[PDB]
Amino acid sequence: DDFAKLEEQFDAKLGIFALDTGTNRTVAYRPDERFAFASTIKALTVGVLLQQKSIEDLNQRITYTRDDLVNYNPITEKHVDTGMTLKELADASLRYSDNAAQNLILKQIGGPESLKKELRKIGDEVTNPERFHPELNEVNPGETQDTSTARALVTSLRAFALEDKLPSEKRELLIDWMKRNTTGDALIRAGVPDGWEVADKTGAASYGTRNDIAIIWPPKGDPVVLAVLSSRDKKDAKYDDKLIAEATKVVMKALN
Numbered sequence: 001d002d003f004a005k006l007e008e009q010f011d012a013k014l015g016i017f018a019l020d021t022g023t024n025r026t027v028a029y030r031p032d033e034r035f036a037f038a039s040t041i042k043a044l045t046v047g048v049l050l051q052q053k054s055i056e057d058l059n060q061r062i063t064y065t066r067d068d069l070v071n072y073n074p075i076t077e078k079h080v081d082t083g084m085t086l087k088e089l090a091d092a093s094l095r096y097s098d099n100a101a102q103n104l105i106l107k108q109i110g111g112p113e114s115l116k117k118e119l120r121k122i123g124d125e126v127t128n129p130e131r132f133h134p135e136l137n138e139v140n141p142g143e144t145q146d147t148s149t150a151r152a153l154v155t156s157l158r159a160f161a162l163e164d165k166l167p168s169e170k171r172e173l174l175i176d177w178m179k180r181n182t183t184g185d186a187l188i189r190a191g192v193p194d195g196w197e198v199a200d201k202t203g204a205a206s207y208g209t210r211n212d213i214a215i216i217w218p219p220k221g222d223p224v225v226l227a228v229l230s231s232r233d234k235k236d237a238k239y240d241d242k243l244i245a246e247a248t249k250v251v252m253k254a255l256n
């Protein structure tokens with residue numbers, strides 16, 4: 001198998017699920033295997049935020065301090081004195097994987113347990129948010145806290161971005177943020193021809209966990225929704241982006 005081969009080449013475990021929303025054809029490989037979801041959860045978290053707020057309500061300004069900043073704060077670290085609006089925090093979380101921005105958003109929607117409950121409400125019984133940054137990224141093999149599966153992430157991303165868990169105006173915000181992600185150029189985007197629009201959210205965590213979930217719009221036709229998840233056996237393992245890009249090429253061929 002080509003996915004087997006990639007696991008062999010990169011000494012890693014792959015979880016793949018892809019759904020062609022036009023034909024309902026799928027590609028699956030360990031689709032129900034749990035991984036730490038890492039930063040991919042940011043995309044569903046903005047999903048819930050959008051559901052719970054009007055678009056105008058996203059203009060509420062959040063005051064924060066150094067105490068709210070954590071390990072990776074590319075946008076939030078610049079605006080402690082002014083604060084940021086919810087809209088600006090959603091942009092920072094989604095486009096730069098700003099961890100403080102995700103923590104602030106999570107607090108505004110009622111914390112990890114509240115996020116879990118809202119995910120259950122949209123039909124996701126798999127994804128298990130429990131912790132804030134930075135703790136959520138430390139997941140040992142066999143533990144379920146802060147994990148999901150490729151199938152569940154695809155199903156939930158679809159629900160928010162493409163189906164009816166959000167009104168069109170809010171779907172458009174979400175899709176536009178993910179389309180202009182700056183963190184993903186070496187992953188799913190790198191397995192898809194230039195010029196196909198891709199909306200994605202990346203993650204990275206311990207045990208060399210390296211994830212990307214995306215919606216891909218092919219030259220006309222309906223979009224594909226894809227999760228590529230990976231992990232490795234040693235806690236301090238490095239990852240390689242190229243695994244995700246090569247996995248994406250295998251998916252596109254299998255759907256073509």
Ligand SMILES: CC1=C(C(=O)O)N[C@@H]([C@@H](C=O)NC(=O)Cc2cccs2)SC1
Nearest residue numbers: 038039072097099137183202203204205
């Ligand atoms: C590189 C990276 C990303 C990303 O590419 O999406 N997002 C942030 C977050 C979510 O996955 N990861 C962490 O905070 C944990 C880390 C792993 C490696 C360095 S920090 S910060 C680390």
